[PDB]
Every structure is written in structure tokens, then in C-alpha cells.
Amino acid sequence: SMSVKKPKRDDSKDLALCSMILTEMETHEDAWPFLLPVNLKLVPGYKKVIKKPMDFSTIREKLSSGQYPNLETFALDVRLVFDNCETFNEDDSDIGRAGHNMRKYFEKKWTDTFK
């Protein structure tokens, strides 16, 4: 509350560290369904079903242009990639498995870097 602050966590290396994590995800071999926006003209259903499209290239642009106020907002967009993947794909498909693999990959690096 007013004039009563919790001790200051050092957030000064967060930008660099999120960028490193994103690089590691961009270069994973199961990243391929997630590198670019889903083409909303050519994939039936995606536009209507998936309310908030997200992909790594779009996350990379937002990070590079000061569009993430903090590391929580960044983690939300990464999770959104995988949550959309589960909505639109069978677990038993190449894309469905890729999604599960990348989420697990992400979440370990997230915890090992920040928690």
C-alpha cells in the first residue's frame, strides 16, 4: 500500500532472458507449426474458432518493439500458442504432439530461468 513496498526484485535482465528462451523455441525441431501466423484464408475454421491467434514470429516482433510490459504478459502469449494448438488439433496428430512437446520444453526453461 501507499509508502509501503515489498523488496525490489531485479527485472533488468528479463528482456534478454525472454529473448534467449524464444530463440531456443524458434530453433527447436518441433517448432514448425508455430513459426508463422496460421493463414486464415486457407485453413477452414481457424478464423471463427480461434479468437486470439498467436505465433512465435508475432511474439518476436512484440518483444523487439516494447509491446510486453513484463515477463508475465510474455509467458501468456507463449501459452496462448499452445492453448490454441490444443483447441484445434487432436492430441494424436503430428501438430498436437508438437504442441505438447513445446509446452513442456518452454515450461522447464521458464522455471529454470525465473523460479
Swiss-Prot record:
Location relative to the cell: Nucleus
What tissues has this protein been observed in?
A: Expressed at varying levels in several tissues, whereas a smaller transcript was expressed specifically in testis.
Which part of the chain is the Bromo domain?
9-113
What the record says about family reads: Belongs to the WAL family.
Q: How does it assemble?
A: Component of the BRF-1 ISWI chromatin remodeling complex, at least composed of SMARCA1 and BAZ2B, which regulates the spacing of histone octamers on the DNA template to facilitate access to DNA. Within the BRF-1 ISWI chromatin remodeling complex interacts with SMARCA1; the interaction is direct. Component of the BRF-5 ISWI chromatin remodeling complex, at least composed of SMARCA5/SNF2H and BAZ2B, which regulates the spacing of histone octamers on the DNA template to facilitate access to DNA.
What does it do?
Regulatory subunit of the ATP-dependent BRF-1 and BRF-5 ISWI chromatin remodeling complexes, which form ordered nucleosome arrays on chromatin and facilitate access to DNA during DNA-templated processes such as DNA replication, transcription, and repair. Both complexes regulate the spacing of nucleosomes along the chromatin and have the ability to slide mononucleosomes to the center of a DNA template. The BRF-1 ISWI chromatin remodeling complex has a lower ATP hydrolysis rate than the BRF-5 ISWI chromatin remodeling complex.
> What protein is this chain from?
Bromodomain adjacent to zinc finger domain protein 2B
